[model samples]
Target: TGDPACRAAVATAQKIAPLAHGEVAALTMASAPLKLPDLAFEDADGKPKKLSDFRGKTLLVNLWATWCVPCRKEMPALDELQGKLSGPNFEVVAINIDTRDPEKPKTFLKEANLTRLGYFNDQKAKVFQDLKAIGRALGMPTSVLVDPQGCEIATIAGPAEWASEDALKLIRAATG
Candidate 1:
């Protein structure tokens, strides 16, 4: 918290981030699996949510941004995947980091026509550093899957097709 280097890094990195490809800049080697926090966040619909909301269920918690193209590309897949897995065991929620205005998520949802999702917002991603979990950065659309017990199963620094075979199997395994 008192680390000057860490403070300056967030400021500097935010500038450099827009120049890179639309990927959530992460310090950790995403190739290595991840463990997500079981934190709660508010959705567009004014509901409180946390990993427990999906307890005993597999979840794809995608962090996204409206200005990010790759994120936009993956939204439909997330919607499709959630619907395809629409049962008692799995869930998918795209967490939008546009906290400039909470209603921003609602606008994006309408523009994109995304459905069955609990749009999560954290404004400026302050939640990342506040949680001390997202670490140095969170590019545009990073995603992590949470197992039934609320541990992070995995994360891809960049976007992925939520309904892919590998993803499905991963969620299926976590569901139980």
Candidate 2:
């Protein structure tokens, strides 16, 4: 409507909208996998860590807040996903973005029985802000699929069935 780029984009969306559905639905595919920002955070031991530390693996970076009900609801499924897929090539790095004391998330994770997932934290929330700047995050429970090369494959803005068959297929496709 305003420019050739806009018109072209609209035309492309119109053509591809019908084709993107079912298992492939809910994915916002990048033109090319784009490198993610290496935001810093802490582990359960309170030691510093960064996404770059996990560069040699595929990551499903799920941003969530402890207070968010949907985030809490999806935590167990995420743990299941990690239990099944975490290894040399893949991991589910769920980051807690709660603004309160770090101990809260720690206790929550332990209580929720999330033994498979790591205790990744961004209490200061720069990770969420950085992801928002790139349009990869809108609110809590933003899950991003990252390739082994540290590039983003897709982003889901809401809670998803991380352990479901269709969801596993999506993760496998992104992992490859």
Candidate 3:
């Protein structure tokens, strides 16, 4: 039930773990890299998507809901992070897990003027359960930094200033 192929990811994580500081100080580097479950969600147009669909790029996978105060607070930082770093090699996959009133999250994003992040949602919120089963999700605003091979590099259980220099440096180290 483990990914032997992710051993290299552990090495990379160890090398970059020290870079976590200040705004990203809570980021926990993976001591034993594991393949993440292929989280299921939908895009803006209701198109199905999975974590595996992002295989070749580094990702900041976040699970949030409109009801979670910190999650709402973190959205703009995430939006800014995406604006600053989204490209062929990296992306921020912020998935909304609002089980009711799907339009609420969409409306929040619109009102917040968060434009850089691509809208993705799991109305069933199964993505949270799957990650919870693996001990990856403890609460709202869960985030995992994944390597290009879909292995975990680091994870943070709460919100961080994703656009802060510390976070950008840590992510660049992981992607580099």
Candidate 4:
């Protein structure tokens, strides 16, 4: 079973699932209250972090890689989404999963001028395995909208226009 508070969040997500259209038409709202894995990753400064570290905030959790073209294409949009909505209550946690040269993704982010999204990485890509274990990571560029309680509100298996009006409306509803 999931947290009691998460059930209420799930209810809220259900009501806004219809808002997921246009550039975010692929979002699949959660059918039940489900807590996410406490995924482990690292910060830009090499400091360790976990999903639980953002327990009090809503997160648009994304697993992306430099080699994944769609993931690369969506980086700017994710950055824009972070710039527009990040606050004490919400964030876009776009975790890079590039296993080889760690600096490659960082350099790509810089060259692409994606400055708003925080730099988080899982070199071993264990976070993908963790989500896959729960049947949430079916492919590359996985994204999940998680409530403040770390419960899943919705998930998408591929990239979305995170900066699009459709996506913003959906995220606003999730955070509300």
Per-residue error (Å), model 3, residue 176:
1.1
Per-model TM values vs. the true structure? 0.69, 0.84, 0.98, 0.96
Backbone clash count for every predicted candidate, in the order shown: 4, 0, 0, 0
Best by lDDT: 3
RMSD of 2: 5.9
lDDT of candidates 1 onward, in order: 0.60, 0.76, 0.93, 0.91
> TM-score rank, highest first?
3, 4, 2, 1
Best by TM-score: 3
Candidate 3, residues 50-83, lDDT tens digits: the string is 9999999999999999999999999999999999
Candidate 1 segments whose C-alpha is farther than 4 A from its true place: 1-35, 130-138
The TM-score measured for candidate 2 stands at: 0.84
Per residue, candidate 2 scores C-alpha lDDT tens digits across 76-139 of 9999999888888889998888887768888888898787887888889899999988888887
> Tens digit of lDDT per residue, candidate 1, span 15-116?
333332223223122232234555666676657666567777656677777778888888888887888786776778677777566666677778878867
Which ten residues in a row are the worst by lDDT in model 4?
Answer: 1-10
Better of 2 and 3 by TM-score: 3
Report clash pairs, candidate 4.
none
Instruction: Tell me the tens digit of each residue's lDDT in model 4 across 129-154.
Output: 99999899999999999988899889
